[PDB]
RNA sequence: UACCUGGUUGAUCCUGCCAGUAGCAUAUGCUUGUCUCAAAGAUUAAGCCAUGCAUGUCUAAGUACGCACGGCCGGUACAGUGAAACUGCGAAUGGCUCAUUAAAUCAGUUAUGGUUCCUUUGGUCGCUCGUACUUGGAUAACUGUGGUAAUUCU
RNA sequence: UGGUGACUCUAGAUAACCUCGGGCCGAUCGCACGCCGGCGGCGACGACCCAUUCGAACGUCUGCCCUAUCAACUUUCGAUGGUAGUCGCCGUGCCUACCAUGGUGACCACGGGUGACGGGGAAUCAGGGUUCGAUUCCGGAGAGGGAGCCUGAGAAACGGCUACCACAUCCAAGGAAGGCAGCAGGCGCGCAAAUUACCCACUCCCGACCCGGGGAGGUAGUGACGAAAAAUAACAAUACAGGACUCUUUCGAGGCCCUGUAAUUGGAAUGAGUCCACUUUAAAUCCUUUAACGAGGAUCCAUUGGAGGGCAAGUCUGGUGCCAGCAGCCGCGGUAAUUCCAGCUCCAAUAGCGUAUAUU
RNA sequence: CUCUCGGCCGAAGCGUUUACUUUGAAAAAAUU
């Protein structure tokens, strides 16, 4: 209920169809506030749903007030998933990383590169 | 060094086979041997007395027959 | 080395590009183009660092092969493009029109232009010569090659060229009495109209250019560039009209902007 | 190659002479007029001073009309009416040699802090600046040096989140109200 | 902050050094509660190296006959994704160190009217008076047979 | 024709040449398909030659530490110059042939040394100066040492090849394979220096490339090199104790503050830590934000040096007795030791403080 | 300080040449 949540430097980027924006959370006795609970504020702040917003870089003052971050609000889910970043479709469930680690697929790259042909494909 | 992995413990034992070594004087001075293995055969049973066999790898010096043998207990 | 460099570090790079000391090790280096890599904006910091499109390099390299950005009316996919002096950058998805104009400081200001003042250009010719079979060429200072140029061209003229085409609408001839801009130097970005110019054969020649406000400078002849035929000039200029104010005026000014806007 | 700076600077000098009974007894009453936890502090406070004379000592080696000379020096005189140490009246570069490092220490939030009579001693002042009951303007300052600037100085609360201030008693009083 | 103090004599004044004093960098000793930055196998050995990694790369646009595929509709020349391989590019950048080096390197200043230059950008590409509605031989990948104790061998 | 300060420049005209180890003069792919049996719109790969960009490479002028117990050096084997050529991308003893005897030097040539890569720069400093600069930026050099190459626009390349020299790996004894002064790591060396961690998210770079790759770089771990901020407690009431204002001849009488001893009391505020959660981030950690717990002196206990002088602070007490030792220097110690070894107390700086060494 | 070519001025020589001093333009960023 006191959580208030403000706007500055705000732009509507047509090249990469979306608004992007700095968010400042004003939460005078909580915590700092999760993501959802700012995705939801802006979601009905400008009348778009909260599925299609993207924040991030949240930084809390000394002190106990403000909070700053970064938002952008996408036309469709379309441009945000041809144009946000991985690991940002990752938070919100849109994306699968692989599991396998660095090592164990350089160590795979050099084990087949001591190999010809499609003999390649069978080691590993 | 951690040993919590077999990982750690063969790259605990590189570490143990390339140290500098330090070394004890009364050792290299004299010739010491830990037993392997140890058989006896006894003169008499009565007796309570007999030849030992000790067997195991020598360490020190080079191992002479001639010089007493003092086993530490 | 044993070939050509192809990295470029930060405290390396050219300072009129305005980077930071902590971002990365590494500044873009520009690719080989119409302009020297001294005196260029590479792409990625006009629509990264400048006009805040973008916020990474991803998002630059995302912006262009999306094909919006244009450099004299042609369509650039490299990020690291060399864009120079009066060149024109176009942003059709907006509807914006930029020159690349140096700033007053000597930095590119970031000049929104209107977009019929989009389809031409003033160059700065670096060089006449007559080849094949007797037809003469011009070659001016973004290494754009034009054959059978108007024989009144002389070196250091300016000319006036369609974009769509190029080629020549119309052109300046390098005289006193006419308005030029400094491209190099320490009076980069100065606007004043030409006095004398001085012959030192066999060296560089020496210009001498007076402000608006009686303020008399020089420079060489390699940083001259005739905007304007008399006083008027051919192109729009930025938000200061190439009035370099010391350091007191500045401070005055910005004092005065602290009162009137509170 | 690191994208990391490696600009410091040493922010007091040690003394020449050791052991010198005039200089320890007037660091020690400074320390005490102003509750200061060692010399270094006083030491950092006399550096600030010593480099502010150097660059008006430098600035008035200058003709009086020198562009610099009057850049520089209505820069310097405004710094330094802006933190509260000059006067308006006497802001002119010959006067800059006149200051005084109990000019600047005055000028600390510990300091300020006392005068305003949110605190009752000046040791007071310093505990409750670094227990987070200060705030200035706004923001919560949690530093006893913290220089005030004389805009600044008229609006030195006691952030509402503490005791003192607005509410929520800390944890002494709910222990000790939570005995029956 | 433009500074000095102890020590030659019975005592004095000098010359004069030794010692003291403060900073700065290495090392080392004792000690160490919080927080922000942050150098770090240079010195001696440009000594020697187990192991692992550090340079790879495909777009609608050079070559797809590997069912490797869910898969067209079926005489559909080539639907699409596509391992492998050929072709092209890069691997001459970056990173490391400071052994060599004393008008050498390097710095500022100038010349190439004495040279080359992948790439990018612009110019030029019926300006030559003399089977084309498409030319030829292979070679990988693939199948099959092997050699050596051993190799990114063939 | 056009230009330069100056062409043996550019362009023009003529007579020919034009290398089989050969020069350009498109037998290439994609997307939409559409108009008078035929024409076509964009784009990608191409291409001899110009110019441009990134360069590179040879030159011009001036500038470097010590040394004369280095005073003459260079030229048979190029040293200085001329002529013609060879080679080279080009200018040139770059090399050859034929000639001339020149060239450098006390204004320090030549030789030797350097615990010498050079600059940007750093420490110190009144002013002048002294010293440092292996070290992230620019330039050079080199990949154990030398040498010679292939490919290529670019390398005399070493995470390319071929040798010799020195090391050194697997051997079935015939053969085969090497190069951490990259990142970690190890041995050795030493007074002297960190993890065989995670990621390509940021910065950029390479490629046929919006997609792949990067021990470049980023992020954590170690880190008292060094720099910045900053705890270890504050307050109130009483009992003594001072110094002031008023009234008193004075003594004294008070309501005015201050100070510690508190072997006196009292609750309040807390960060250290414990630890949900959010935030941070590629994923984390840390910082920040926050619930809950977390403070009475036997604790949540601050050290390092010193106490004759220089130089701040004991002629205290006990022990030792020219011994042990202290002492940068002057000196102390041989029975009242202000100096040793301890106890107490005191002094300086303080999360820091000693000591050795280089330097100012 | 001036004789010739061009619009009271611009070109051409200067003036024995320097040293000195003042100004102008070149002297990467980082660091100061």
Redesign the pocket.
């Known amino acids: 209920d006191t959580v208030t949540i403000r706007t500055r430097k705000f732009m509507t980027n047509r090249l990469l169809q979306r608004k992007q924006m700095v968010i400042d959370v004003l ?10 609970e700012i995705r939801e504020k802006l979601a009905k702040m400008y009348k778009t749903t909260p599925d299609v917003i993207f ?11 403000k ?1 700053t ?1 970064f938002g952008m609000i996408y036309d469709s889910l379309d441009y945000a998933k ?1 144009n946000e ?4 479709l ?2 919100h469930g849109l994306y699968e ?2 599991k ?4 164990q ?17 069978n080691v590993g | ?2 040993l919590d992995t077999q ?2 413990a ?2 605990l034992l ?2 143990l086979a ?4 330090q070394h004890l004087a009364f050792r290299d001075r004299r010739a010491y041997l830990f037993a392997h293995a140890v058989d006896f055969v006894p003169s008499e049973e009565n007796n309570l007395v007999g030849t030992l066999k000790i067997s195991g790898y020598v360490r020190g010096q080079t191992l002479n027959v001639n010089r007493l043998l003092h086993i530490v207990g | ?15 009129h590009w305005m ?1 930071d ?19 260029c904006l ?1 792409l ?2 006009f629509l ?2 400048r006009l805040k499109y973008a ?8 912006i262009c ?3 919006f950005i244009k450099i ?1 009316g ?1 369509v ?7 864009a120079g002096f009066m060149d024109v950058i176009s942003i059709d998805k907006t509807g914006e029109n930029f020159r690349l104009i140096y700033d007053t400081k000597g930095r590119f200001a970031v000049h929104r232009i209107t977009p019929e003042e989009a389809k031409y250009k003033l160059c700065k010719v ?12 011009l ?1 001016t200072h ?6 059978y140029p108007d ?1 009144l061209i ?2 250091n003229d300016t000319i006036q060229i369609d974009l769509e085409t ?1 080629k020549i609408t119309d052109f300046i001839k390098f005289d006193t009495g006419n308005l030029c801009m400094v491209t ?4 980069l970005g100065r606007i004043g109209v030409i006095t ?4 030192h ?6 210009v ?1 250019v007076k402000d608006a406000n009686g303020n008399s ?4 002849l ?2 001259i560039f005739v905007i304007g035929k008399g006083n008027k000039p051919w192109i729009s200029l930025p938000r200061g009209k190439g009035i370099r104010l010391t350091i007191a005026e500045e401070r005055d000014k910005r004092l005065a902007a602290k009162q009137s806007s509170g | ?21 005039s ?2 007894d007037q ?2 009453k400074l320390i005490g007029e102003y509750g200061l ?5 006083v ?2 406070v ?2 600030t ?2 480099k502010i ?2 660059a008006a000592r430098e600035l008035l080696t200058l003709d009086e009309k020198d562009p610099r000379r009057l850049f520089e020096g209505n820069a310097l005189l405004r710094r330094l009416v802006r933190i509260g140490v000059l006067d308006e009246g006497k802001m002119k570069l010959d006067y800059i040699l006149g200051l005084k490092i109990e000019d600047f220490l005055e000028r600390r939030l510990q300091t300020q802090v006392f005068k305003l009579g949110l ?6 002042a ?8 200060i705030r200035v303007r706004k923001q ?1 300052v ?5 220089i005030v600037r004389l805009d600044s100085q008229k609006h030195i609360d006691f952030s509402l ?4 201030g607005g509410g ?11 005995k029956g």
């Open positions: 939460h005078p006795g909580k915590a700092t506030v999760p993501k959802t924040v991030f870089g949240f930084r809390t003052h000394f002190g106990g007030g909070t971050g041809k970043p991985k690991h940002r990752a938070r990383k692989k396998t680690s660095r090592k697929r350089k160590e795979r790259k050099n084990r087949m590169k001591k190999v010809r042909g499609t003999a390649k494909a | 060094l951690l990982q750690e063969g790259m590189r570490q390339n140290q500098k070594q | 080395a044993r070939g050509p460099k192809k990295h470029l570090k930060r405290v390396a790079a050219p300072k980077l000391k902590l971002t990365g090790v590494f500044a873009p280096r520009p690719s080989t183009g119409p302009h020297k890599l001294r005196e590479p990625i910091i990264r660092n916020l990474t390099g991803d998002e630059v390299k995302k092969m999306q094909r004299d042609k650039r996919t490299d990020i690291t493009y060399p670096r060089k006449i010569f007559v080849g094949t079979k007797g037809i003469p060429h070659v973004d290494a754009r090659t034009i054959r024989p002389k070196v190029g190099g130097g320490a009076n004398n110019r001085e012959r054969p066999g060296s560089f020649d020496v001498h400078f020089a420079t060489r390699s940083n | 190659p690191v994208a990391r700076s490696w600009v410091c600077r040493k922010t007091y000098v040690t003394p020449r002479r050791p052991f010198e009974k200089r320890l660091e020690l936890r060692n010399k270094r502090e030491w950092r006399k550096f001073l010593a004379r150097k605190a009752k001693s000046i040791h007071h310093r505990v409750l600046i670094r227990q987070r009951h919560v949690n530093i006893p040096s913290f989140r503490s005791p003192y929520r008693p800390g944890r002494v009083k709910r222990k000790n109200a939570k």
